[PDB]
Amino acid sequence: SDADVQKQIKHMMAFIEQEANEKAEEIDAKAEEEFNIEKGRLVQTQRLKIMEYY
Amino acid sequence: NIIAAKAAEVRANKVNWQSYLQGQMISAEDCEFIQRFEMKRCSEEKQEMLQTEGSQCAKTFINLMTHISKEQTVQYILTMVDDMLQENHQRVSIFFDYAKRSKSTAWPYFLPMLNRQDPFTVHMAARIIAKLAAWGKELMEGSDLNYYFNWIKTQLSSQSDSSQYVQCVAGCLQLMLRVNEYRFAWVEADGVNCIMGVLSNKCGFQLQYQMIFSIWLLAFSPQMCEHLRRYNIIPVLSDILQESVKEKVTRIILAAFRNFLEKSTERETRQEYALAMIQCKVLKQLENLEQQKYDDEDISEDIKFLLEKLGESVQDLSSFDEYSSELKSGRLEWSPVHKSEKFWRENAVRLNEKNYELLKILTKLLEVSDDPQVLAVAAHDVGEYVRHYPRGKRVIEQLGGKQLVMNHMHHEDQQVRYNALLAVQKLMVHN
Amino acid sequence: FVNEVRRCEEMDRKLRFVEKEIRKANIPIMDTGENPEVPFPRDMIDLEANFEKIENELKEINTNQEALKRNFLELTELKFILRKTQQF
Amino acid sequence: TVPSILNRMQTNQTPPTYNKTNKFTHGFQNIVDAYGIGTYREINPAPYT
């Protein structure tokens, strides 16, 4: 039946859009760690000058 | 898959909260709040209500999940909370504020739900817990963290609706592992060895990717890269990378391998990983993967990165000092140096150093050793020495080593016989 | 599927090469039974490594057989030369 | 797990022509095919042949 093929069409459509979320979670995991690293570097850069000043 | 299908059925299977109020299972304030919440449907309507009524919001959902035994009702409440946090994760702060007002962590409200008999109810608890504990500033810790991990490990060890439930478990772990502290605590959990076991049992490709994404998160942190060596990751993931076809699995393994060689605390730990990769034929696989082509060039960049870092490891391994050290240590165990054509082609004359000391070792190992690997490798090395330094034939004859390989061509192990045959054949190839 | 077919094209040439060596040697090809295809999993790489193993062993062992035989023949001539020249 | 199921097509060009054959019929189909291949659904010379 074409309806049972259409259930597979709906599954494959949901599957690729779920895969986009899974790639977005890879992107999120990369970006949040790198964000914390860059924030940490920028903090430590001025914090070191502040420690030397005091 | 199963939890999304069961959630869609549960979203249709709504219930009359006034019946639980009449049955004294809930307060009038809980019933009136949940009935208003079913009618608040714009984001602004939900925001006004939740921002105005946050203590009663947490109290309502906590009471209606905790005290009610009727599965379809608790399933619905868990579905509404999972949807509420999926619509905006900042709502975790309402449950945490109510826990702080109650002089408690949030975990004791949700952890009891993992003890229910229904798979959807316990996995929806795990989903909400993963969101709550990962998006929260409050840390899941000690016994509460161990209960969640032990529930995960229990479901993992069971390995189909059962497999689709475990896919939700893997997703619940992936969300939790967004937090660095929870990842390091998971390295301290032997559940990493359970994951290696499930991969070795050749679970579905969906679980392979979801698990290896969790491994890739661990592989990002230098501290964990040093600690996790014990779990034999590269062998397992290299088997999956060689055997499995899927681009998703391929990408996330190459990303894990890149993270290991980028992030490791030591050049020695990078060399340990790169050596294990080369031994696990990863370089040969990477070369095939370079000829394969993809819809995501990050795969190709990770291949090039790994091929370069493994190329440096081959250059390090191709040192005559490392070769000398391995001979002096007797470690003739198919270290990739032995098969380095570049090494032999460009360096075989060096074995004449210190009055032929390395050849004296090779022949002495062919005299003394029982180990067929040491024997086969020492014969291979004699063969390559002759192959790239033909004047060496007379030196091996002066050491008597021709007779040792001529004995070992009849050794009980074909690996010895073969390499000993090659070596004696090169010794005998011309005057 | 450039690579996958190209691998098959070369593995077929490797089959033809080892088969020609076997047929020149008149070693009997057994030709027994009938068989399924390879798995979809990457096991064709282990098969490709087996093709390379046989080919490399033939090229090496043939060259050695020739060289060793030639040396033995030259040394036989030299044995007779030395025995006859010993009259001087 | 995906069973890879088909849909039957409707916006069709004329398909290739097939006939099942066996020992007593194959040569007869071949000598017919050798002049030309019948149109789709066309009467087959081969059984009368």
Swiss-Prot record, chain A:
This is V-type proton ATPase subunit E 1. Expressed in brain (at protein level). The modification Phosphotyrosine is found at residue 53. It comes from the Eukaryota. The chain holds residues 4 to 57 of 226 of the full protein. It is found in: Apical cell membrane; Cytoplasmic vesicle, Secretory vesicle, Synaptic vesicle membrane; Cytoplasmic vesicle, Clathrin-coated vesicle membrane. Subunit of the V1 complex of vacuolar(H+)-ATPase (V-ATPase), a multisubunit enzyme composed of a peripheral complex (V1) that hydrolyzes ATP and a membrane integral complex (V0) that translocates protons. V-ATPase is responsible for acidifying and maintaining the pH of intracellular compartments and in some cell types, is targeted to the plasma membrane, where it is responsible for acidifying the extracellular environment. The gene is Atp6v1e1. Belongs to the V-ATPase E subunit family. GO terms for cellular component: apical plasma membrane; clathrin-coated vesicle membrane; cytoplasm; cytosol; endosome; extrinsic component of synaptic vesicle membrane; microvillus; vacuolar proton-transporting V-type ATPase, V1 domain. The keyword Amino-acid biosynthesis does not apply. Its main location: membrane. One of its GO terms (molecular function) is proton-transporting ATPase activity, rotational mechanism. One of its GO terms (biological process) is proton transmembrane transport. Keywords: Acetylation, Cell membrane, Cytoplasmic vesicle, Hydrogen ion transport, Ion transport, Membrane, Phosphoprotein, Synapse, Transport. V-ATPase is a heteromultimeric enzyme made up of two complexes: the ATP-hydrolytic V1 complex and the proton translocation V0 complex. The V1 complex consists of three catalytic AB heterodimers that form a heterohexamer, three peripheral stalks each consisting of EG heterodimers, one central rotor including subunits D and F, and the regulatory subunits C and H. The proton translocation complex V0 consists of the proton transport subunit a, a ring of proteolipid subunits c9c'', rotary subunit d, subunits e and f, and the accessory subunits ATP6AP1/Ac45 and ATP6AP2/PRR.
UniProtKB/Swiss-Prot annotation, chain D:
Disulfide bonds: none annotated. The modification Phosphotyrosine is found at residue 18. It is found in: Cytoplasmic vesicle, Clathrin-coated vesicle membrane; Cytoplasmic vesicle, Secretory vesicle, Synaptic vesicle membrane; Melanosome. The modification Phosphothreonine is found at residue 14. Subunit of the V0 complex of vacuolar(H+)-ATPase (V-ATPase), a multisubunit enzyme composed of a peripheral complex (V1) that hydrolyzes ATP and a membrane integral complex (V0) that translocates protons. V-ATPase is responsible for the acidification of various organelles, such as lysosomes, endosomes, the trans-Golgi network, and secretory granules, including synaptic vesicles. In certain cell types, can be exported to the plasma membrane, where it is involved in the acidification of the extracellular environment. Required for assembly and activity of the vacuolar ATPase. Belongs to the V-ATPase 116 kDa subunit family. V-ATPase is a heteromultimeric enzyme made up of two complexes: the ATP-hydrolytic V1 complex and the proton translocation V0 complex. The V1 complex consists of three catalytic AB heterodimers that form a heterohexamer, three peripheral stalks each consisting of EG heterodimers, one central rotor including subunits D and F, and the regulatory subunits C and H. The proton translocation complex V0 consists of the proton transport subunit a, a ring of proteolipid subunits c9c'', rotary subunit d, subunits e and f, and the accessory subunits ATP6AP1/Ac45 and ATP6AP2/PRR. Interacts with SPAAR. This is V-type proton ATPase 116 kDa subunit a 1. It comes from Rattus norvegicus. The lineage of its organism: Eukaryota, Metazoa, Chordata, Craniata, Vertebrata. The gene is Atp6v0a1. The chain holds residues 347 to 395 of 838 of the full protein.
